[PDB]
A paper describes a structure:
Their function requires the transport of Fe2+ from the exterior of the protein to buried di-iron catalytic sites, known as ferroxidase centres, where Fe2+ is oxidized to form Fe3+-oxo precursors of the ferritin mineral core.
High-resolution structures of SynFtn revealed that the side chain of residue Asp65 lies in close proximity to Glu62, raising the possibility that the two residues form a transient binding site for iron. Protein structures derived from all crystals harvested without iron enrichment were free of bound metal ions, as expected. However, the rate at which Fe2+ binds to FOC sites in variant D65A was only 50 % that of the wild-type protein under the same conditions, suggesting a role for Asp65 in uptake of Fe2+. In contrast, the initial rate of mineral core formation in variant D65A is 0.35 µm s−1, only ~35 % of the 0.95 µm s−1 rate of wild-type SynFtn, consistent with the hypothesis that Asp65 plays a role in transporting ferric-oxo species away from the FOC. Therefore, the impaired mineralization activity of variant D65A cannot be a consequence of increased stability of the di-Fe3+ form of the FOC, as was reported for variant E62A, suggesting that the replacement of Asp65 has a less direct effect on the exit of Fe3+ from the FOC. In the absence of Asp65, the pathway for Fe2+ into the FOC may be altered, apparently resulting in inhibition of Fe3+ egress, and suggesting that the pathways for iron entry and exit from the FOC are closely associated, such that disruption of the uptake route can cause a clash with the exit route.
Residue numbers in the entry:
A (entry chain A), B (entry chain A), C (entry chain A), D (entry chain A): 5 to 182
């Protein structure tokens, strides 16, 4: 029985390029987390309490997603490498602009997973593609959700009354098409 | 065992300037109470039932805060001096104007507590600073709440539909960012 | 009514040096969070499942403490500034060494709060000292807890059997003197 | 409607090399089952009751996994071919040695699934890759579990006291990092 790079018994070696890609993806999700925190703060500063609560929950969820990846590296007997985290964007001219950045961030998170997925396919790492499959499924749902929230905010067309209605929807947990 | 100015056994004498400041602060909170009553009446006159219910509750709460201070003077064996109460402001041109006065009143209530706090610090009255600490904490929460209500009303920008939505939030007890 | 730097109604202006200190302290707690995450990973890599679970919970708690501070700045109508986050330490020669770093991190977190506290005292910001008081209380409890865990691990003197016993204590939630 | 090799209606023909690989994999899991039975006996002979209970359960689980594969061949209208089963290994010099064989067996079971998976990919048999995906996921979890048990036993470094503690963990069902 061989020992893996993190010292645990090694079921199968992992290509170092794939390992680097997973460590980088963990940073992408940690950065999404602090971005959603920044977005929750921006909404709280404008009394958009429902949007604040929504993004506060998204920040915690994104952090949990990042930790899920750290656990996979542990399970594969690979080293983790927690990286420097850039400061998030913190200023937006409107809720519609913020929601566009949020949608883009979710899509970019999926693109990162897709990049890791293609690398695992090139390396015939079926543990990793299997591990990623449900995370891609979750990303489909999150993209659908964030397209819904962005589209609904854009429909409001900057009207405060409509944005207050949507804010209350979010406070109630009405955050998807259902 | 010495007797305090109100006749009870005296644990520690209080500086007369600090006593005067506490008696004056009791008047500040009694005045906030009747101001919130006046604000509840103004809202009821315009069918803003949720704002009316909110300010009716705030008036009762502010009175309770004033009585809490009268109990502290009793506990310190100091005399109370319930003072003449000015008539409140009763006319506003808009809900946004009323909410600005409400926020100012809360901030001014905190400033009064801060004034008493600094006097107790100068007199090394640690009973009084300890007594005031949780009241300052409550003031932080109330300032955050009234900034939320004022900011949300200003976001409405005088639109009746948005103000009706916010009114219903208040009727439901949705009065903070949460 | 004046508007604060984050745009909300302003109850009382805050000294920019104190604001900078609070923003820096938020970074200190975010850094403690990712450090505890790194520590949980190190323990998981060595099958110390109870220590892994403990530090995983501490990472989430420290993040919550950081967000509590962001909410205070919102309440004071001050801007948040979420900063770049350094990479955590990730390598230790022993559990005793890791636990010493953990204790040091908790003590350093308290020192940061103490620094902010003294600045607020110099600026007579009683809202901020009142806000910090319960956080200092929590820090006392955490220092007592981490001295307990470090002391118990040092008592084990590197014996695997004793460290396995302590690991199981932590898995069961037995993490304090009680 | 065509009839498959086992006589049932045939949804889609299967490549004979892939069929042979699945039949061989069923033997691999049946062999893992009797190996875990042998391991449970070895532990019972040394009064390691928790390890005995653990491996007794693993033997039954591995058999269930093998039968799950026989059901898939039935569903694909393919013939099963239950093969001669070699005698398991039955002697180990230590618990650490046994646990290393156990980890190796789990990793080798995954390698067999990976071999079948690559053959299905080469034959564009998407039913089979979909069928195998959750089994690979389970293998990730089992490899993580057996690395945990092996690593914890190695940490004990042959000390009876530590091995008795771990034995009791296993009796209680504490068999993973959690
Ligand atoms: Cl907008
Ligand atoms: Cl208005
Ligand atoms: Cl140690
Ligand atoms: Cl051994
Ligand atoms: Na990387
Ligand atoms: Na795939
Ligand atoms: Na007076
Ligand atoms: Na004090
Ligand atoms: Na700073
Ligand atoms: Na103080
Ligand atoms: Na075969
Ligand atoms: Na596939």
């Amino acid at each position: 029985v061989a020992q893996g790079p993190n010292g645990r018994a090694l079921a199968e070696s992992m290509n170092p390029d794939l390992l680097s890609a997973i460590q980088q993806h963990i940073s992408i999700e940690r950065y999404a987390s602090v971005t959603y925190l920044a977005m929750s703060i921006w909404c709280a500063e404008r009394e958009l309490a429902g949007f604040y609560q929504f993004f506060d929950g998204e920040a915690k969820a994104e952090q949990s997603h990042a930790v899920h990846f750290t656990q996979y590296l542990i399970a594969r007997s690979q080293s983790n490498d927690l990286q420097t985290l850039d400061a998030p964007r913190q200023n937006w001219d409107s809720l519609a602009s913020l929601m566009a950045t949020a949608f883009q961030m979710e899509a970019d998170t999926t693109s990162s997973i897709q990049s890791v997925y293609a690398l695992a396919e090139r390396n015939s790492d079926t543990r990793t593609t299997v591990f990623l499959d449900p995370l891609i499924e979750a990303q489909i749902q999150s993209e659908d959700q964030f397209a819904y929230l962005l589209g609904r905010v854009k429909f409001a067309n900057g009207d405060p009354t409509a944005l207050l209605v949507i804010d209350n929807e979010l406070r109630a947990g009405q955050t998807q098409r259902g």
